[model samples]
Target chain A: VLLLDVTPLSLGIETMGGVMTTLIAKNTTIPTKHSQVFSTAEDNQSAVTIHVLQGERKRAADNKSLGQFNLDGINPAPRGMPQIEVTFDIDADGILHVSAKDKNSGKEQKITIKASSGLNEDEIQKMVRDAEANAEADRKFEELVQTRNQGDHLLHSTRKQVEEAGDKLPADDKTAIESALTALETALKGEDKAAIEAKMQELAQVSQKLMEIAQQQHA
Target chain B: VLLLDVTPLSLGIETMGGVMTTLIAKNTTIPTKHSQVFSTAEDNQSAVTIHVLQGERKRAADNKSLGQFNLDGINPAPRGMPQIEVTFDIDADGILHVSAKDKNSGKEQKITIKASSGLNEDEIQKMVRDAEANAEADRKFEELVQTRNQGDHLLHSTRKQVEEAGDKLPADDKTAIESALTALETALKGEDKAAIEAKMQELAQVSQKLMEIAQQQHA
Candidate 1:
């Protein structure tokens, strides 16, 4: 199977008016090809440097330089007489591969260039691990908070009910009930499990006392 | 303002049988609240360790421990008498901030914990940057490939026309026409701009030559 393929990078040639003429644009998928034609800048110019860049900038300085290939053994002809051929081929992984050949003399040259991007394989793996760890920590914290809130709400509601039912009960029964409620409230605020439990026990005792008082009053 | 908030971490709690209980699951929106009530494990114990963890695992060991706070100063009551409250709160930006208060004593404690999602601000920014860069590169690479493919198609179609119109044209005209088409084809296979450009120039010349041939034929 073809594991790797090259992709062409954006490239442009300098025009006579000093404008860069783009041959290939960026982000093209791989197994792609492009060709452009040009003529010699000067007469008897036996060689020329094909400057390759990897960005959309119009100026050579602004774009990433992909290095240059020299075209040698040119036919001696007047300026714009001897035509030159250039071709670009890119594979699947965004690698820019290039080739050129002189049509008259059949001379050819080729080169491949690498592109830069972040998040290599190892880094990606580490990031994933960190993400997993962070997720776990957050989950536990949330659960603990939820449990605490429910307990608070229960205690608050119970206290409200007890206060509303005041004055109708006997003094001793009322005192017992109030004491239990107070203990529970104190524990809830203090983060003290023992105090909360004592308060709960006191509330149970008051409930029993109120029941006894009701029986006595009915009798 | 809350730009983004999601519980990137999973939360779970341990049960009586040591089985893990999950709360505030992952991918849940933040600024969320959850609570659970826990009883004192031992009698006359005034304090309990509220183990807060973040993770999706069934066991506390499997999750990451964020922080642990002791709910102290209880009423020294018997076991199962007092209730230990646990509460978790997650804020926007997926940060877990926790606060716990004893219901009886009203003693409250709070701590701000970092996000368990393992994606720091800088790391996330870098990821975003890298994604944009790669996208741009891929786009340019695709365009180059498309342009090359188009050139190849043009070469194919032009050659077919030349073959059909053979021998009827003058030697210079036919040679020029054939040379240009061949130059494009050969350069396209390679990765040199000069060679590709030369082929393109040759192809342009041949195109003119073919047009002349067509004119003559018409006459």
Candidate 2:
């Protein structure tokens, strides 16, 4: 079984003065259930509009109104006589499922609304694919830039160190060092990794020559 | 020779009402100095309050007020008459060093203010120690939880599979599987690395036994 979970959407109820009373905020854990008991706004009212909105704003007008459902054929009872229980259940994928039941008459109604802000599922999938492709391209470009920058920095610093230590070296060591420097410069200009490795090998061959020269100087 | 580079702290004058002439900013590359000129706030003023603040906020009220320095013994000059040059320098450790000089009289004044947030050097060091301790504790806790959960889940699923494959496997293989399950249960209940490792070993042993049994039955 494939397990998919979605973030819960925000839900709020409109007050008598048309202010939205937020019960559950957005990005909440899924499979949530909430019920609110509300009274009739006016006496002898046969219908009421249930306006549901989703957002973080305090005002109902500022938030995005998802949908509105009307409850009709009420018993025309007195104000605050009948109780309507509204329950909101958010499924695993963040889809909103609402249910309203009249406590006195046992009349029930349910509606499942697609919580697509503007783009549908298909459009969002396409956008995600495009974004992934763009990100991959950008990653490759950044990797190439980093590789070139590292090579340039290493070449400059190493060449400077070799030049500073040149005069104190033996003849064979000096010749090997010069050859390595030339090869390194060529590799840097052409950005050839194999040539760079070959140059590093030549540089390593001069280490013994330098040790012999140091021993002679000490003696 | 040892180098003692003393950087001067610079102060700048405001051009207009909105413009904030920078005195000093934190974490500037070390051994750098800058100077700016400031005029008298009022005409015939012998003293002026130099309010200092830190941060990138445009307004003086918005930034954290560092401290105030009062300049006294002025010649009661006219507005914009006596221009004071305030020089700011940063040392090697990015510490701000400051000095002020009167352009006309060549008088000099120096002061140092340590600008740091609530976390001191010692407090930061203590916090690092605490973070490392907490991370170590968390890693151990997670490992324990993972070991127990994996053992329990594997035993539960394997037992169910064995029961479902009833009469298909031989008697010796069934007895071996039961022994492995008992060993896994005992190891999972104990709280130690050795116990967990023993449980994993038993689990692998049982898996091999079951595979051999299945192969023999197919043959």
Best model per lDDT: 2
Candidate 1 ranges beyond 4 A from true positions: A1-174, A178-219, B1-4, B12-19, B116-219
> Candidate 2, B200: how far from true, in Å?
48
- lDDT (Cα, tens digit) per residue for candidate 2, span A58-168: 445644576778777678876667788888776654567776778878777776766454233343345345445566654544444444445544455445455555677
Clashes by residue pair, model 2:
A6-A92, B8-B88, B8-B89, B9-B87, B9-B88, B9-B89, B9-B97, B9-B98, B10-B87, B10-B88
List fnat, each candidate: 0.04, 0.00
lDDT of candidate 2 at residue B156, scale 0 to 100 = 69
For candidate 2, the per-residue lDDT at A5 reads 28
Backbone clash count for every predicted candidate, in the order shown:
92, 10
| Global lDDT scores for all candidate models | 0.55, 0.57
**CA error at residue A127 for candidate 1, angstroms:** 38
Q: Candidate 1 on A1-219: residue-level lDDT in tens? A: 665443323565554423345666544556577766565654356886777755444444544556778889875543343446677766665666766676556678877776453234464456445445555443443333333343444454334334434565667766666676666666666544445545554564445434333223222
Candidate 1 structure quality by residue, lDDT tens digits, B74-159: 66543443555566777766576666665555566766777654445564456445545565544444444544544564565455
Cα-based TM-score, every candidate: 0.30, 0.27
